[PDB]
Amino acid sequence: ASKKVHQINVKGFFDMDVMEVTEQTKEAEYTYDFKEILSEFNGKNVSITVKEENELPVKGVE
Amino acid sequence: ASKKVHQINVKGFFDMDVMEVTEQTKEAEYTYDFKEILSEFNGKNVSITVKEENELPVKGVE
Amino acid sequence: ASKKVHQINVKGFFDMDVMEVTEQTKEAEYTYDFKEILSEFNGKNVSITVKEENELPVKGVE
Amino acid sequence: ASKKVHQINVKGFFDMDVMEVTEQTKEAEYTYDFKEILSEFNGKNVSITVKEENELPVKGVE
Amino acid sequence: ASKKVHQINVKGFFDMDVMEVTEQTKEAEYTYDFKEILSEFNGKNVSITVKEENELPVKGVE
Amino acid sequence: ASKKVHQINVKGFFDMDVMEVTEQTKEAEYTYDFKEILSEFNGKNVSITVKEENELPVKGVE
Amino acid sequence: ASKKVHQINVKGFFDMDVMEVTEQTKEAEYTYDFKEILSEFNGKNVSITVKEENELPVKGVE
Amino acid sequence: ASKKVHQINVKGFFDMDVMEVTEQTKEAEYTYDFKEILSEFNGKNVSITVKEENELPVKGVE
């Protein structure tokens, strides 16, 4: 069960055209290039997760 | 706190050149194209996780 | 193990008569119709969870 | 933080027309009526979760 | 896997002599009697967890 | 955030009269006396959890 | 499944030369000696986790 | 929230004298040297977790 784990978490607005993820913090607006990140993993067994969560359509605010 | 979550989990051998992930099950060897999967999210806020876990270098076996 | 997950979380005061869940936010009072939400899943395999948590009967506040 | 939690987990094939969830066990096929279950919570604050997970579209099995 | 779970969480200062647990909130000091709570479960299969966490002995402060 | 945690997990059939918990393993049938266990914590802030999970009333096996 | 767990969590700047971990709280600067802590476990089956998390190299701060 | 995580998990019999952890798998007996592992983190903010879990003292085996 012993193992070495290496993981990258990236949260932000995704633009696959320029292949970049950019998050709007409370101070700035950071931009990470998913391409470079992804490449660090090219050639190996990985576990990739892509989550997108939105709001629930309401039917009435009071 | 109510929300609608949509998530994709993909585990397998990653080849970013052809942009495909392929896992070796006990029964068959499935191949998913990360490109198509990724595109379903292009243009929205996301969390991407990319995990890669290996074994620990030993020094004694018996 | 690769898969596509789609999940809906709804937290609020439940009224099964009108089939609606409504949560009280420190800014407003949203109302979601559990019927419409539930219907998005009609006809498929699902894990459903319904939690209700209350307070513990005390034997002395101070 | 002390509290009393009461929760119901139901996993199966969902039919909202007859309002029943039915899971296929390697020993039998159980059927629960979501209506009765849901009613045990009518009139209270609740967190409800509805998950539906499917497979990932492949581009080549082998 | 479908099931009905019923759980009690109780956090506070424990006195087994009078069999009572009492927590000091920011607003008030609640007192729950572990005896009554425990009895609700007498006669059934359970999981009991009892956790106690303290601070780590330091050796340098600045 | 550094801390020392000490925790006890006890799963089995609960009998508060003789104050003992007894689990039926695959080999034997172990019996732990909740009294002794509980006492190790008498006099300190703790987080106690008592869970009891049962099966869901069915309406039809096929 | 019943068991007694004993666990130590230590978060801070690690210096293996003097074998000490030191975290910078919003108040003080605590220093724990990993040596003493580690010794409390010498001679036992353990599980050890060492995590180090950094920031993601950006390409566009704004 | 985006970040790079690097984590090591080590489970086995701990000997701090020789500074080695050794686990007994269902096949072999692997030995890892905690010293080398630990050094990979010397000089960094880390989180360290050391857990040791034992069995509960019974009062009636059967």
Short mmCIF file of C-alpha atoms in Angstrom, two decimals:
data_model
loop_
_atom_site.label_atom_id
_atom_site.label_comp_id
_atom_site.label_asym_id
_atom_site.label_seq_id
_atom_site.Cartn_x
_atom_site.Cartn_y
_atom_site.Cartn_z
CA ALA A 1 0.00 0.00 0.00
CA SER A 2 3.00 2.26 0.30
CA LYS A 3 3.20 4.64 -2.60
CA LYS A 4 4.31 7.97 -3.95
CA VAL A 5 1.48 10.15 -5.14
CA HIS A 6 1.89 13.27 -7.31
CA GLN A 7 -1.21 15.31 -8.00
CA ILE A 8 -2.22 18.61 -9.67
CA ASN A 9 -5.53 20.43 -8.86
CA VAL A 10 -6.57 23.28 -11.19
CA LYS A 11 -9.69 25.31 -10.74
CA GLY A 12 -10.77 28.12 -13.06
CA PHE A 13 -12.47 29.16 -16.30
CA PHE A 14 -11.48 26.60 -18.97
CA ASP A 15 -10.57 27.54 -22.53
CA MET A 16 -9.46 24.51 -24.48
CA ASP A 17 -8.75 26.57 -27.60
CA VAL A 18 -5.69 28.27 -26.13
CA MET A 19 -5.59 25.35 -23.64
CA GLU A 20 -5.56 27.49 -20.47
CA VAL A 21 -7.38 27.51 -17.14
CA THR A 22 -7.82 30.82 -15.35
CA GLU A 23 -9.25 31.41 -11.84
CA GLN A 24 -10.54 34.70 -10.46
CA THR A 25 -9.28 34.94 -6.87
CA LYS A 26 -10.11 37.65 -4.27
CA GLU A 27 -6.87 39.50 -4.99
CA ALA A 28 -5.93 38.72 -8.63
CA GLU A 29 -6.78 36.59 -11.65
CA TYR A 30 -4.33 33.73 -12.16
CA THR A 31 -3.82 31.86 -15.42
CA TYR A 32 -2.38 28.38 -15.71
CA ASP A 33 -1.68 26.70 -19.04
CA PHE A 34 -3.29 23.28 -18.94
CA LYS A 35 -1.01 22.23 -21.79
CA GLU A 36 2.19 22.49 -19.74
CA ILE A 37 0.51 20.94 -16.72
CA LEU A 38 -0.94 18.05 -18.73
CA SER A 39 2.43 17.37 -20.37
CA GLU A 40 4.07 16.64 -17.03
CA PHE A 41 1.87 13.54 -17.13
CA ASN A 42 2.19 12.49 -20.77
CA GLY A 43 3.33 8.89 -20.86
CA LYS A 44 2.01 7.42 -17.64
CA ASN A 45 -0.98 5.87 -15.89
CA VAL A 46 -3.09 8.63 -14.35
CA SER A 47 -6.47 9.35 -12.76
CA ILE A 48 -8.06 12.43 -14.27
CA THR A 49 -11.10 14.19 -12.94
CA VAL A 50 -12.99 17.05 -14.52
CA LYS A 51 -15.81 18.50 -12.45
CA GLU A 52 -18.16 21.32 -13.34
CA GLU A 53 -20.78 22.41 -10.85
CA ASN A 54 -23.62 24.86 -11.49
CA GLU A 55 -26.63 26.28 -9.66
CA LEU A 56 -30.08 24.71 -9.47
CA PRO A 57 -32.83 26.28 -11.61
CA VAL A 58 -35.18 27.92 -9.14
CA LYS A 59 -38.86 28.50 -9.47
CA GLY A 60 -39.23 31.35 -7.00
CA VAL A 61 -37.22 33.64 -4.72
CA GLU A 62 -38.98 35.29 -1.72
CA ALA B 1 -25.79 24.98 -1.28
CA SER B 2 -28.14 23.28 -3.72
CA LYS B 3 -26.40 22.60 -7.01
CA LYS B 4 -26.11 20.44 -10.08
CA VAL B 5 -22.78 18.66 -10.44
CA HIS B 6 -21.52 17.01 -13.64
CA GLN B 7 -18.27 15.11 -13.42
CA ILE B 8 -16.00 12.92 -15.58
CA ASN B 9 -13.45 10.44 -14.12
CA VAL B 10 -10.90 8.95 -16.51
CA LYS B 11 -8.23 6.51 -15.48
CA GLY B 12 -5.68 4.92 -17.83
CA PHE B 13 -2.43 5.30 -19.77
CA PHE B 14 -2.21 8.91 -21.03
CA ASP B 15 -0.98 9.88 -24.47
CA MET B 16 -1.30 13.61 -25.04
CA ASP B 17 0.08 13.35 -28.56
CA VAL B 18 -3.03 11.59 -29.86
CA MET B 19 -4.86 13.01 -26.83
CA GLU B 20 -6.23 9.69 -25.62
CA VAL B 21 -6.45 7.83 -22.33
CA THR B 22 -6.55 4.07 -22.34
CA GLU B 23 -7.13 1.71 -19.39
CA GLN B 24 -6.33 -1.99 -19.20
CA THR B 25 -9.25 -3.75 -17.44
CA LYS B 26 -9.25 -7.45 -16.50
CA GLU B 27 -11.67 -8.16 -19.35
CA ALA B 28 -10.78 -5.57 -22.05
CA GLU B 29 -8.59 -2.57 -22.91
CA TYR B 30 -10.81 0.54 -23.20
CA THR B 31 -9.68 3.71 -24.97
CA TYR B 32 -11.25 7.08 -24.27
CA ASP B 33 -10.30 10.22 -26.14
CA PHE B 34 -9.49 12.92 -23.66
CA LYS B 35 -10.00 15.53 -26.41
CA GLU B 36 -13.75 14.84 -26.80
CA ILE B 37 -14.22 14.51 -23.03
CA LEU B 38 -12.34 17.75 -22.35
CA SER B 39 -14.36 19.64 -24.97
CA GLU B 40 -17.62 18.92 -23.19
CA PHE B 41 -16.28 21.40 -20.62
CA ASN B 42 -14.65 24.03 -22.86
CA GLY B 43 -16.01 27.43 -21.87
CA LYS B 44 -16.93 26.91 -18.23
CA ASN B 45 -15.67 26.99 -14.64
CA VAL B 46 -14.14 23.67 -13.62
CA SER B 47 -12.05 21.70 -11.19
CA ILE B 48 -9.45 19.55 -12.93
CA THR B 49 -7.52 16.95 -10.94
CA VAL B 50 -4.68 14.95 -12.49
CA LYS B 51 -3.25 12.29 -10.16
CA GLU B 52 -0.38 9.92 -10.85
CA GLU B 53 0.64 7.39 -8.22
CA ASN B 54 3.70 5.17 -8.28
CA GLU B 55 5.44 2.65 -6.04
CA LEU B 56 8.00 3.43 -3.36
CA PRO B 57 11.63 2.66 -4.05
CA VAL B 58 12.48 -0.31 -1.82
CA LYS B 59 15.81 -1.17 -0.31
CA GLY B 60 15.10 -4.64 1.00
CA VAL B 61 12.89 -7.46 -0.15
CA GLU B 62 12.50 -10.89 1.43
CA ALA C 1 -13.33 2.77 -13.41
CA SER C 2 -13.71 5.67 -15.80
CA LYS C 3 -17.21 7.10 -15.72
CA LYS C 4 -19.51 10.05 -16.17
CA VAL C 5 -21.28 11.17 -13.03
CA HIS C 6 -24.31 13.53 -12.91
CA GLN C 7 -25.58 14.49 -9.50
CA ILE C 8 -28.14 16.86 -7.93
CA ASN C 9 -27.93 18.13 -4.33
CA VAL C 10 -31.00 19.83 -2.86
CA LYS C 11 -31.19 21.13 0.68
CA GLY C 12 -34.26 22.83 2.11
CA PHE C 13 -37.64 22.51 3.79
CA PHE C 14 -39.43 19.56 2.12
CA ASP C 15 -43.10 19.60 1.11
CA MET C 16 -44.09 16.45 -0.71
CA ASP C 17 -47.68 17.63 -1.14
CA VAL C 18 -46.69 20.31 -3.65
CA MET C 19 -43.48 18.31 -4.21
CA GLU C 20 -41.13 21.21 -3.57
CA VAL C 21 -37.96 21.82 -1.57
CA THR C 22 -37.26 25.36 -0.37
CA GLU C 23 -34.10 26.62 1.41
CA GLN C 24 -33.79 29.77 3.50
CA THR C 25 -30.71 31.71 2.47
CA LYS C 26 -29.33 34.69 4.45
CA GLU C 27 -30.21 36.70 1.29
CA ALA C 28 -33.39 35.03 0.01
CA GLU C 29 -35.79 32.08 -0.01
CA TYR C 30 -35.34 29.84 -3.04
CA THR C 31 -37.85 27.24 -4.14
CA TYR C 32 -37.00 24.23 -6.24
CA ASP C 33 -39.58 21.80 -7.55
CA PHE C 34 -38.40 18.33 -6.67
CA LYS C 35 -40.77 16.94 -9.34
CA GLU C 36 -38.93 18.51 -12.28
CA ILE C 37 -35.55 17.66 -10.72
CA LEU C 38 -36.56 14.04 -10.01
CA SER C 39 -37.91 13.64 -13.57
CA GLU C 40 -34.48 14.35 -15.04
CA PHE C 41 -33.58 10.95 -13.63
CA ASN C 42 -36.70 8.92 -14.46
CA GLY C 43 -35.72 5.77 -16.31
CA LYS C 44 -32.16 5.26 -15.02
CA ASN C 45 -30.01 3.71 -12.33
CA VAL C 46 -29.50 6.12 -9.43
CA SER C 47 -28.23 6.46 -5.89
CA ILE C 48 -30.63 8.61 -3.90
CA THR C 49 -29.93 10.01 -0.51
CA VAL C 50 -32.30 11.71 1.85
CA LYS C 51 -30.88 13.09 5.04
CA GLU C 52 -32.66 14.90 7.86
CA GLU C 53 -30.64 16.11 10.82
CA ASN C 54 -32.08 17.61 14.01
CA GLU C 55 -30.75 18.77 17.39
CA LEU C 56 -30.14 16.65 20.46
CA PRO C 57 -32.66 16.83 23.29
CA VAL C 58 -30.86 18.63 26.13
CA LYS C 59 -31.39 18.25 29.81
CA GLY C 60 -30.16 21.75 30.55
CA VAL C 61 -29.22 24.90 28.60
CA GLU C 62 -27.36 27.77 30.31
CA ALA D 1 -22.25 20.45 16.94
CA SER D 2 -24.06 17.61 18.66
CA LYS D 3 -26.97 16.35 16.59
CA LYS D 4 -29.26 13.53 15.62
CA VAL D 5 -29.00 12.45 12.01
CA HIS D 6 -31.54 10.24 10.17
CA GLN D 7 -30.72 9.29 6.62
CA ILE D 8 -32.06 7.03 3.84
CA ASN D 9 -29.91 5.69 0.97
CA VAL D 10 -31.69 4.13 -2.00
CA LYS D 11 -29.92 2.78 -5.05
CA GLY D 12 -31.72 1.21 -7.99
CA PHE D 13 -33.53 1.68 -11.28
CA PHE D 14 -35.81 4.73 -10.86
CA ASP D 15 -39.41 4.89 -12.11
CA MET D 16 -41.09 8.11 -11.12
CA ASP D 17 -44.36 7.12 -12.80
CA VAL D 18 -45.08 4.43 -10.22
CA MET D 19 -42.66 6.28 -7.92
CA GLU D 20 -40.51 3.26 -7.16
CA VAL D 21 -36.80 2.46 -7.03
CA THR D 22 -35.72 -1.13 -7.68
CA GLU D 23 -32.17 -2.57 -7.38
CA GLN D 24 -30.89 -5.77 -8.98
CA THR D 25 -29.03 -7.84 -6.42
CA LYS D 26 -26.93 -10.92 -7.32
CA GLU D 27 -29.53 -12.83 -5.24
CA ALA D 28 -32.79 -10.98 -5.95
CA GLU D 29 -34.63 -7.91 -7.25
CA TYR D 30 -35.86 -5.65 -4.46
CA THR D 31 -38.43 -2.92 -4.93
CA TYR D 32 -38.76 0.08 -2.67
CA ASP D 33 -41.51 2.65 -3.00
CA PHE D 34 -39.86 6.04 -3.02
CA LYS D 35 -43.26 7.59 -2.13
CA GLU D 36 -43.48 5.98 1.31
CA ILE D 37 -39.78 6.64 1.95
CA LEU D 38 -40.03 10.29 0.84
CA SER D 39 -43.13 10.81 3.03
CA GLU D 40 -41.17 9.95 6.17
CA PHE D 41 -39.46 13.28 5.56
CA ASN D 42 -42.40 15.48 4.51
CA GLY D 43 -42.48 18.60 6.65
CA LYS D 44 -38.79 18.92 7.60
CA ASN D 45 -35.43 20.32 6.61
CA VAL D 46 -33.49 17.84 4.48
CA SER D 47 -30.46 17.38 2.26
CA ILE D 48 -31.42 15.32 -0.76
CA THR D 49 -29.00 13.84 -3.19
CA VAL D 50 -29.70 12.23 -6.50
CA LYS D 51 -26.80 10.72 -8.36
CA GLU D 52 -26.76 8.97 -11.71
CA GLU D 53 -23.49 7.61 -13.03
CA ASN D 54 -22.94 6.14 -16.50
CA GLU D 55 -19.99 4.86 -18.55
CA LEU D 56 -17.66 6.90 -20.71
CA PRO D 57 -18.14 6.80 -24.47
CA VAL D 58 -15.14 4.87 -25.82
CA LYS D 59 -13.48 5.22 -29.16
CA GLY D 60 -12.22 1.65 -29.12
CA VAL D 61 -12.70 -1.51 -27.03
CA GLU D 62 -10.35 -4.50 -27.44
CA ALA E 1 -26.76 -1.30 -0.44
CA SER E 2 -29.99 0.55 0.27
CA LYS E 3 -30.38 1.20 3.97
CA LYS E 4 -31.77 3.38 6.71
CA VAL E 5 -29.14 5.00 8.91
CA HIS E 6 -29.83 6.64 12.29
CA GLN E 7 -26.94 8.37 13.97
CA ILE E 8 -26.18 10.48 17.07
CA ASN E 9 -23.13 12.81 17.34
CA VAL E 10 -22.30 14.20 20.78
CA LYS E 11 -19.40 16.50 21.47
CA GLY E 12 -18.54 17.99 24.88
CA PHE E 13 -16.99 17.48 28.31
CA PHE E 14 -17.70 13.88 29.42
CA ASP E 15 -18.67 12.91 32.94
CA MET E 16 -19.44 9.21 33.16
CA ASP E 17 -20.28 9.46 36.86
CA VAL E 18 -23.49 11.38 36.19
CA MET E 19 -23.36 10.01 32.65
CA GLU E 20 -23.64 13.38 30.92
CA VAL E 21 -21.86 15.19 28.11
CA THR E 22 -21.77 18.95 28.12
CA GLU E 23 -20.46 21.30 25.39
CA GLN E 24 -19.52 24.95 25.74
CA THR E 25 -20.85 26.82 22.67
CA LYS E 26 -20.13 30.50 21.95
CA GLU E 27 -23.70 31.37 22.95
CA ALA E 28 -24.62 28.79 25.64
CA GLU E 29 -23.45 25.69 27.54
CA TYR E 30 -25.60 22.70 26.48
CA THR E 31 -25.81 19.50 28.53
CA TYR E 32 -26.89 16.21 27.01
CA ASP E 33 -27.31 13.05 29.05
CA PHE E 34 -25.37 10.27 27.41
CA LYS E 35 -27.48 7.74 29.35
CA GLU E 36 -30.75 8.62 27.57
CA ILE E 37 -29.00 8.92 24.20
CA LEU E 38 -27.22 5.58 24.65
CA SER E 39 -30.46 3.83 25.64
CA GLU E 40 -32.11 4.68 22.34
CA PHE E 41 -29.67 2.10 20.95
CA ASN E 42 -29.72 -0.57 23.67
CA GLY E 43 -30.46 -3.91 22.03
CA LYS E 44 -29.13 -3.41 18.52
CA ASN E 45 -26.07 -3.61 16.27
CA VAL E 46 -24.07 -0.38 16.33
CA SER E 47 -20.88 1.45 15.54
CA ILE E 48 -19.61 3.49 18.48
CA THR E 49 -16.77 5.96 17.97
CA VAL E 50 -15.21 7.84 20.88
CA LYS E 51 -12.58 10.39 19.81
CA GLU E 52 -10.49 12.63 22.04
CA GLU E 53 -8.04 15.06 20.48
CA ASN E 54 -5.44 17.13 22.29
CA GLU E 55 -2.62 19.53 21.46
CA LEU E 56 0.97 18.58 20.69
CA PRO E 57 3.60 19.18 23.32
CA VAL E 58 5.71 22.07 22.01
CA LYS E 59 9.35 22.74 22.66
CA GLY E 60 9.67 26.22 21.23
CA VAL E 61 7.35 29.17 20.97
CA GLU E 62 8.09 32.59 19.50
CA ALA F 1 -3.56 22.35 13.45
CA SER F 2 -1.02 19.94 14.86
CA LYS F 3 -2.62 17.60 17.33
CA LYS F 4 -2.63 14.24 19.02
CA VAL F 5 -5.74 12.22 18.37
CA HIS F 6 -6.79 9.12 20.34
CA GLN F 7 -9.82 7.25 19.13
CA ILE F 8 -11.77 4.02 19.88
CA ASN F 9 -14.13 2.35 17.32
CA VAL F 10 -16.44 -0.40 18.61
CA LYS F 11 -18.86 -2.28 16.45
CA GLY F 12 -21.19 -5.00 17.71
CA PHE F 13 -24.47 -5.90 19.41
CA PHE F 14 -25.04 -3.36 22.21
CA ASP F 15 -26.35 -4.29 25.65
CA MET F 16 -26.39 -1.29 27.93
CA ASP F 17 -27.67 -3.33 30.88
CA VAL F 18 -24.40 -5.20 31.36
CA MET F 19 -22.77 -2.33 29.41
CA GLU F 20 -21.05 -4.52 26.78
CA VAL F 21 -20.68 -4.50 23.01
CA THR F 22 -20.19 -7.80 21.23
CA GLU F 23 -19.42 -8.37 17.51
CA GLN F 24 -19.86 -11.62 15.60
CA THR F 25 -16.81 -11.98 13.34
CA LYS F 26 -16.16 -14.68 10.68
CA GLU F 27 -13.99 -16.68 13.08
CA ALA F 28 -15.23 -15.89 16.62
CA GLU F 29 -17.53 -13.68 18.67
CA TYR F 30 -15.66 -10.94 20.52
CA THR F 31 -16.99 -9.05 23.53
CA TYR F 32 -15.79 -5.63 24.63
CA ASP F 33 -17.02 -3.94 27.80
CA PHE F 34 -18.12 -0.45 26.87
CA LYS F 35 -17.79 0.54 30.52
CA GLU F 36 -14.01 0.09 30.63
CA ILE F 37 -13.62 1.67 27.21
CA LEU F 38 -15.81 4.65 28.10
CA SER F 39 -13.92 5.19 31.36
CA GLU F 40 -10.64 5.79 29.54
CA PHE F 41 -12.36 9.00 28.43
CA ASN F 42 -14.10 10.09 31.63
CA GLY F 43 -13.04 13.63 32.41
CA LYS F 44 -12.24 15.11 29.03
CA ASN F 45 -13.63 16.78 25.92
CA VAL F 46 -14.63 14.10 23.41
CA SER F 47 -16.56 13.53 20.18
CA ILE F 48 -18.87 10.55 20.48
CA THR F 49 -20.72 8.93 17.64
CA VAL F 50 -23.30 6.19 17.83
CA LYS F 51 -24.53 4.84 14.51
CA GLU F 52 -27.11 2.16 13.87
CA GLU F 53 -27.92 1.16 10.33
CA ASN F 54 -30.73 -1.14 9.21
CA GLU F 55 -32.25 -2.43 5.98
CA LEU F 56 -34.91 -0.69 3.90
CA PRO F 57 -38.45 -2.09 4.09
CA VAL F 58 -39.08 -3.66 0.69
CA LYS F 59 -42.33 -4.05 -1.12
CA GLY F 60 -41.38 -6.91 -3.41
CA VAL F 61 -38.55 -9.33 -4.19
CA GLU F 62 -38.38 -10.94 -7.68
CA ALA G 1 -13.56 -3.87 13.03
CA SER G 2 -13.40 -2.54 16.56
CA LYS G 3 -10.06 -0.92 17.24
CA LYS G 4 -8.04 1.65 19.14
CA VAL G 5 -6.45 4.30 16.94
CA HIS G 6 -3.67 6.69 18.03
CA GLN G 7 -2.66 9.33 15.55
CA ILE G 8 -0.31 12.37 15.36
CA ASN G 9 -0.74 15.19 12.80
CA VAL G 10 2.05 17.70 12.37
CA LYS G 11 2.00 20.58 9.93
CA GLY G 12 4.85 23.03 9.44
CA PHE G 13 8.27 23.84 7.99
CA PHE G 14 10.36 20.66 8.11
CA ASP G 15 14.03 20.64 9.04
CA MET G 16 15.37 17.10 9.12
CA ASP G 17 18.85 18.23 10.16
CA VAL G 18 17.65 19.24 13.62
CA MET G 19 14.66 16.96 13.09
CA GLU G 20 12.03 19.60 13.88
CA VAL G 21 8.76 20.79 12.36
CA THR G 22 7.68 24.35 12.95
CA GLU G 23 4.37 25.99 11.94
CA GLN G 24 3.67 29.71 11.72
CA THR G 25 0.17 30.33 13.24
CA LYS G 26 -1.69 33.64 13.11
CA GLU G 27 -0.33 34.26 16.63
CA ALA G 28 2.90 32.46 17.43
CA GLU G 29 5.58 30.26 15.86
CA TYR G 30 5.39 26.78 17.43
CA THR G 31 8.20 24.24 17.15
CA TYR G 32 7.69 20.54 17.59
CA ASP G 33 10.52 18.04 17.59
CA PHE G 34 9.69 15.33 15.14
CA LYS G 35 12.25 13.11 16.86
CA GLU G 36 10.34 12.88 20.15
CA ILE G 37 7.03 12.54 18.30
CA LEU G 38 8.41 9.84 16.00
CA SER G 39 9.81 7.88 18.91
CA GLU G 40 6.40 7.45 20.48
CA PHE G 41 5.82 5.08 17.58
CA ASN G 42 9.14 3.26 17.37
CA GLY G 43 8.49 -0.46 17.46
CA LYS G 44 4.98 -0.58 16.03
CA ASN G 45 3.01 -1.13 12.87
CA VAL G 46 2.22 2.40 11.69
CA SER G 47 0.93 4.38 8.75
CA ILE G 48 2.99 7.45 7.84
CA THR G 49 1.85 10.21 5.49
CA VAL G 50 4.06 13.11 4.40
CA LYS G 51 2.44 15.65 2.12
CA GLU G 52 3.91 18.77 0.62
CA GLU G 53 1.72 21.06 -1.45
CA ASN G 54 2.90 24.06 -3.48
CA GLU G 55 1.42 26.59 -5.90
CA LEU G 56 0.93 26.12 -9.61
CA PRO G 57 3.37 27.90 -11.95
CA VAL G 58 1.27 30.63 -13.62
CA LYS G 59 1.70 32.16 -17.04
CA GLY G 60 -0.41 35.26 -16.49
CA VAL G 61 -0.94 37.08 -13.20
CA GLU G 62 -3.36 40.05 -13.35
CA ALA H 1 -7.18 26.69 -4.90
CA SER H 2 -5.12 25.30 -7.75
CA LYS H 3 -2.06 23.51 -6.44
CA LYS H 4 0.54 20.81 -6.91
CA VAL H 5 0.48 18.12 -4.24
CA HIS H 6 3.26 15.58 -3.60
CA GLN H 7 2.57 12.92 -1.02
CA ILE H 8 4.25 9.78 0.41
CA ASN H 9 2.31 7.02 2.23
CA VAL H 10 4.25 4.38 4.13
CA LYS H 11 2.67 1.55 6.07
CA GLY H 12 4.64 -1.03 8.05
CA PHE H 13 6.59 -1.99 11.16
CA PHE H 14 8.53 1.08 12.29
CA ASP H 15 12.08 0.91 13.60
CA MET H 16 13.41 4.38 14.34
CA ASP H 17 16.80 3.06 15.43
CA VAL H 18 17.72 2.05 11.88
CA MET H 19 15.07 4.49 10.67
CA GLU H 20 13.22 1.97 8.50
CA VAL H 21 9.61 0.97 7.88
CA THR H 22 8.88 -2.55 6.73
CA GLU H 23 5.50 -4.00 5.67
CA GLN H 24 4.62 -7.68 5.39
CA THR H 25 2.56 -8.15 2.16
CA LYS H 26 0.79 -11.37 1.16
CA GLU H 27 3.87 -12.10 -0.99
CA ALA H 28 7.07 -10.47 0.21
CA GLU H 29 8.49 -8.39 3.05
CA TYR H 30 9.41 -4.93 1.70
CA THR H 31 11.69 -2.53 3.56
CA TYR H 32 11.70 1.19 2.96
CA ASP H 33 14.15 3.55 4.59
CA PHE H 34 12.21 6.33 6.20
CA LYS H 35 15.41 8.40 6.25
CA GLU H 36 15.70 8.67 2.46
CA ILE H 37 11.95 9.20 2.13
CA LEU H 38 11.92 11.87 4.85
CA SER H 39 14.81 13.70 3.26
CA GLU H 40 12.91 14.28 0.05
CA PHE H 41 10.91 16.72 2.15
CA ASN H 42 13.62 18.38 4.23
CA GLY H 43 13.32 22.13 3.84
CA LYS H 44 9.62 22.44 3.04
CA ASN H 45 6.24 23.13 4.55
CA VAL H 46 4.75 19.66 5.02
CA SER H 47 1.93 17.80 6.69
CA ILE H 48 2.96 14.64 8.55
CA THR H 49 0.56 11.97 9.81
CA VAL H 50 1.62 8.99 11.91
CA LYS H 51 -1.12 6.57 12.84
CA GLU H 52 -0.91 3.40 14.86
CA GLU H 53 -4.00 1.26 15.29
CA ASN H 54 -4.33 -1.77 17.59
CA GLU H 55 -7.03 -4.19 18.71
CA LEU H 56 -9.51 -3.63 21.50
CA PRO H 57 -8.91 -5.50 24.78
CA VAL H 58 -11.72 -8.09 24.94
CA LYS H 59 -13.36 -9.59 27.97
CA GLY H 60 -14.95 -12.59 26.29
CA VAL H 61 -13.62 -14.43 23.24
CA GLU H 62 -15.84 -17.27 21.95
#
